[PDB]
Swiss-Prot record:
Summary of subunit composition and partner proteins: Monomer. Interacts with GGA2 and GGA3. Binds to clathrin and activated ARFs, including ARF1, ARF5 and ARF6. Interacts with RABEP1. Interacts with RABGEF1. Interacts with the type-I membrane proteins LRP3, M6PR/CD-MPR and IGF2R/CI-MPR. Interacts (via N-terminal VHS domain) with SORL1/sorLA and SORT1 (via C-terminal cytosolic domain). Interacts with EPN4. Interacts with CCDC91. Interacts with HEATR5B/p200a. Interacts with SYNRG/gamma-synergin. Interacts (via GAE doamin) with NECAP1 and NECAP2. Interacts (via GAE domain) with AFTPH/aftiphilin. Interacts with TSG101 and UBC. Interacts with RNF11.
Protein name (record): ADP-ribosylation factor-binding protein GGA1
Effect of residue 81 to A: Abolishes interaction with RABEP1, UBC and TSG101
Consequence of changing residue 88 to S: Abolishes interaction with RABEP1
Tissue specificity field: Ubiquitously expressed.
Function recorded in the entry: Plays a role in protein sorting and trafficking between the trans-Golgi network (TGN) and endosomes. Mediates the ARF-dependent recruitment of clathrin to the TGN and binds ubiquitinated proteins and membrane cargo molecules with a cytosolic acidic cluster-dileucine (DXXLL) motif. Mediates export of the GPCR receptor ADRA2B to the cell surface. Required for targeting PKD1:PKD2 complex from the trans-Golgi network to the cilium membrane. Regulates retrograde transport of proteins such as phosphorylated form of BACE1 from endosomes to the trans-Golgi network.
Compartment(s) where it occurs, according to its Swiss-Prot or TrEMBL record: Golgi apparatus, trans-Golgi network membrane; Endosome membrane; Early endosome membrane
Part of the intact protein present: 190 to 301 of 639
Length: 105
């Protein structure tokens, strides 16, 4: 009995572990896409809203440990990992466009 229920609580605990991960992936990716879209537009038009652009930059930069951490927690989901690396790549590109611009290119 302490054997069976041990196993159900096992399947249940790991099921919700997949659930939290998916939920964390969604929330992280959606934050990156919004931050990326907005910063990109600003850089586009500025090539003023210095504080506003720098503001978006900080929000982007704070997404670095989030993405690294998650990527670093993908078991055998190469497809999931690719999507997280894709999102990280975009975060790096906007940050570079912004820093470039703030250093006169």
């Amino acid at each position: 009995l302490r054997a069976a229920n041990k196993l159900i609580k096992e399947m249940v605990q790991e099921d919700q572990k997949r659930m939290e991960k998916i939920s964390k992936r969604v929330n992280a990716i959606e934050e990156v896409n919004n931050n990326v879209k907005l910063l990109t537009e600003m850089v586009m038009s500025h090539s003023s809203s210095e504080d506003l652009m720098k503001e978006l930059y900080q929000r982007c930069e704070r997404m670095r440990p989030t993405l690294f951490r998650l990527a670093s927690d993908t078991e055998d989901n190469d497809e999931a990992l690719a999507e997280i690396l894709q999102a990280n790549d975009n975060l790096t590109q906007v940050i570079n466009l912004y820093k470039q611009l703030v250093r006169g290119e």
